[PDB]
Design a protein around this ligand. Structure first.
Ligand SMILES: [Zn+2]
Ligand SMILES: [Zn+2]
Ligand SMILES: [Zn+2]
Ligand SMILES: [Zn+2]
Length: 124
Protein backbone atom coordinates (compact mmCIF):
# COMPACT_ATOMS: atom_id res chain seq x y z
CA UNK A 1 0.00 0.00 0.00
CA UNK A 2 1.04 3.66 -0.07
CA UNK A 3 1.92 5.77 2.94
CA UNK A 4 -0.38 8.65 2.16
CA UNK A 5 0.81 11.99 3.43
CA UNK A 6 4.33 10.69 4.20
CA UNK A 7 7.54 11.59 2.42
CA UNK A 8 11.04 10.24 2.77
CA UNK A 9 13.45 12.66 4.43
CA UNK A 10 16.38 11.19 2.45
CA UNK A 11 15.14 10.86 -1.16
CA UNK A 12 12.07 13.14 -0.93
CA UNK A 13 9.67 10.70 -2.60
CA UNK A 14 6.18 10.78 -1.13
CA UNK A 15 3.14 8.58 -0.78
CA UNK A 16 5.61 5.79 -1.32
CA UNK A 17 4.83 2.08 -1.53
CA UNK A 18 6.28 -0.60 0.69
CA UNK A 19 7.23 -0.25 4.32
CA UNK A 20 7.74 3.00 6.19
CA UNK A 21 10.42 3.46 8.82
CA UNK A 22 9.95 6.27 11.38
CA UNK A 23 12.81 7.55 13.53
CA UNK A 24 12.01 7.66 17.23
CA UNK A 25 14.62 10.37 17.98
CA UNK A 26 14.41 12.86 15.07
CA UNK A 27 11.18 14.84 14.79
CA UNK A 28 8.74 13.85 12.04
CA UNK A 29 11.44 11.85 10.30
CA UNK A 30 10.58 8.99 7.94
CA UNK A 31 12.48 6.81 5.52
CA UNK A 32 11.21 4.73 2.64
CA UNK A 33 12.36 1.11 2.68
CA UNK A 34 15.07 1.72 0.07
CA UNK A 35 16.66 4.46 2.15
CA UNK A 36 16.13 2.57 5.44
CA UNK A 37 17.74 -0.68 4.25
CA UNK A 38 20.58 1.17 2.59
CA UNK A 39 21.58 3.14 5.69
CA UNK A 40 20.61 6.57 4.37
CA UNK A 41 21.34 9.49 6.68
CA UNK A 42 20.72 13.23 6.76
CA UNK A 43 22.10 16.04 8.92
CA UNK A 44 20.49 15.02 12.22
CA UNK A 45 19.89 11.28 11.61
CA UNK A 46 22.27 8.33 12.03
CA UNK A 47 21.87 4.59 11.50
CA UNK A 48 22.15 4.22 15.30
CA UNK A 49 18.76 5.88 15.84
CA UNK A 50 15.83 3.60 16.81
CA UNK A 51 13.32 3.12 14.01
CA UNK A 52 9.73 1.86 13.99
CA UNK A 53 8.26 0.01 11.00
CA UNK A 54 4.76 1.21 10.14
CA UNK A 55 2.26 -0.70 8.06
CA UNK A 56 1.65 -4.33 7.22
CA UNK A 57 -0.32 -7.06 8.90
CA UNK A 58 -3.85 -6.78 10.12
CA UNK A 59 -7.09 -8.67 9.64
CA UNK A 60 -9.83 -7.19 7.47
CA UNK A 61 -13.53 -7.38 6.89
CA UNK A 62 -15.11 -7.85 3.46
CA UNK A 63 -17.33 -4.78 2.89
CA UNK A 64 -19.71 -6.63 0.57
CA UNK A 65 -20.64 -9.62 2.76
CA UNK A 66 -19.36 -8.64 6.19
CA UNK A 67 -17.18 -11.72 6.80
CA UNK A 68 -14.22 -10.89 9.05
CA UNK A 69 -10.69 -12.17 9.52
CA UNK A 70 -9.05 -11.90 6.06
CA UNK A 71 -5.45 -10.92 5.52
CA UNK A 72 -4.67 -8.40 2.79
CA UNK A 73 -3.83 -11.34 0.51
CA UNK A 74 -6.92 -13.42 1.32
CA UNK A 75 -9.23 -10.40 1.22
CA UNK A 76 -8.11 -9.67 -2.31
CA UNK A 77 -8.50 -13.34 -3.32
CA UNK A 78 -12.01 -13.37 -1.81
CA UNK A 79 -13.20 -10.11 -3.34
CA UNK A 80 -11.71 -10.75 -6.77
CA UNK A 81 -13.40 -14.18 -6.75
CA UNK A 82 -16.80 -13.63 -5.12
CA UNK A 83 -17.56 -9.93 -5.64
CA UNK A 84 -15.76 -9.00 -8.86
CA UNK A 85 -18.93 -7.56 -10.53
CA UNK A 86 -20.85 -5.41 -8.03
CA UNK A 87 -21.40 -1.65 -8.06
CA UNK A 88 -22.41 -0.94 -4.47
CA UNK A 89 -20.40 1.82 -2.81
CA UNK A 90 -18.24 0.65 0.09
CA UNK A 91 -15.40 2.04 2.20
CA UNK A 92 -11.95 0.46 2.09
CA UNK A 93 -11.01 -1.21 5.43
CA UNK A 94 -7.28 -1.31 4.61
CA UNK A 95 -6.98 2.41 3.86
CA UNK A 96 -8.81 3.14 7.10
CA UNK A 97 -6.44 0.94 9.16
CA UNK A 98 -3.20 2.42 7.81
CA UNK A 99 -1.85 5.56 9.54
CA UNK A 100 -2.22 8.34 7.03
CA UNK A 101 -4.81 6.01 5.41
CA UNK A 102 -7.86 7.70 3.93
CA UNK A 103 -10.38 7.28 6.75
CA UNK A 104 -13.07 7.14 4.08
CA UNK A 105 -11.96 5.79 0.70
CA UNK A 106 -15.38 5.37 -0.94
CA UNK A 107 -15.42 3.21 -4.04
CA UNK A 108 -17.86 1.33 -6.26
CA UNK A 109 -15.18 -1.00 -7.59
CA UNK A 110 -13.45 -2.44 -4.54
CA UNK A 111 -11.77 -5.26 -6.48
CA UNK A 112 -10.06 -2.72 -8.76
CA UNK A 113 -9.15 -0.65 -5.69
CA UNK A 114 -7.39 -3.59 -4.06
CA UNK A 115 -5.59 -4.53 -7.28
CA UNK A 116 -4.36 -1.00 -7.94
CA UNK A 117 -3.79 0.51 -4.47
CA UNK A 118 -3.00 -2.56 -2.32
CA UNK A 119 -0.73 -4.72 -4.49
CA UNK A 120 0.54 -7.91 -2.85
CA UNK A 121 4.30 -7.42 -2.77
CA UNK A 122 6.50 -6.47 0.20
CA UNK A 123 8.14 -3.61 -1.70
CA UNK A 124 4.76 -2.31 -2.93
ZN1 LIG B 1 13.79 7.33 0.40
ZN1 LIG C 1 16.89 9.95 13.54
ZN1 LIG D 1 -17.30 -10.92 0.84
ZN1 LIG E 1 -7.74 1.06 0.23
Amino acid sequence: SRHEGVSCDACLKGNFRGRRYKCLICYDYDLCASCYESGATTTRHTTDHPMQCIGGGGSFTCPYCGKMGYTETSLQEHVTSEHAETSTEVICPICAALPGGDPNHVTDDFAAHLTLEHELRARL
